[PDB]
Every structure is written in C-alpha cells, then in structure tokens.
Swiss-Prot record:
Note: Present with 16134 molecules/cell in log phase SD medium.
MF (Gene Ontology): proton-transporting ATPase activity, rotational mechanism
Natural source organism: Saccharomyces cerevisiae (strain ATCC 204508 / S288c) (Baker's yeast)
Subunit-structure text: Homodimer. V-ATPase is a heteromultimeric enzyme composed of a peripheral catalytic V1 complex (components A to H) attached to an integral membrane V0 proton pore complex (components: a, c, c', c'', d, e, f and VOA1). Interacts with VMA5; the interaction is direct. Interacts with VMA10; the interaction is direct. Interacts with RAV1 and RAV2 components of the RAVE complex, which are essential for the stability and assembly of V-ATPase.
GO CC term, one of those recorded: membrane raft
Name of this protein: V-type proton ATPase subunit E
Effect of substituting T9A: Increases ATPase activity 1.4-fold
Section of the entire sequence shown: 1 to 69 of 233
C-alpha cells in the first residue's frame, strides 16, 4: 500500500486524528440531534397550533353563524 517507508505516518498523527475525529464526531452528532429535535419539535408544535387554531376558528364561525341564523 505504498506504506513501506513507514516514516510519513508517525504515532502523533494517529492519536491526533483519533481524539480530533472523536471530538468532531460527538460534537457534530450532538449538534445535529439538538437542531434536528428542535426543528422537528417546533415544526410539529407550530403545525398543530396553526391547524388547531384554524379548525377551531372556522368551526366556531360556521357554528356561530348557523346557530345565530
């Protein structure tokens, strides 16, 4: 694998990438989950809120108009 030299691949780079990658992995995953759960939660709650308010509004208007009529 053109790695016969074994001189351009010390241990410093190995460990460095190990921790570095690990840190970026957890940070990236955690951040993605936070933004994913936050956006999804806000999207579901917001959507339901609008749908609920709209349904109640139209239902109340038609119900009130019909009853009053």
């Amino acid at each position: 694998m053109a790695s016969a030299i074994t001189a351009l691949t010390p241990n410093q780079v190995n460990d460095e990438l190990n921790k570095m990658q690990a840190f970026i992995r957890k940070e990236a995953e955690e951040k993605a989950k936070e933004i994913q759960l936050k956006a999804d939660q806000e999207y579901e709650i917001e959507k339901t809120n609008i749908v609920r308010n709209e349904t109640n509004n139209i239902d109340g208007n038609f119900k009130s108009k019909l009853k009053k009529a």
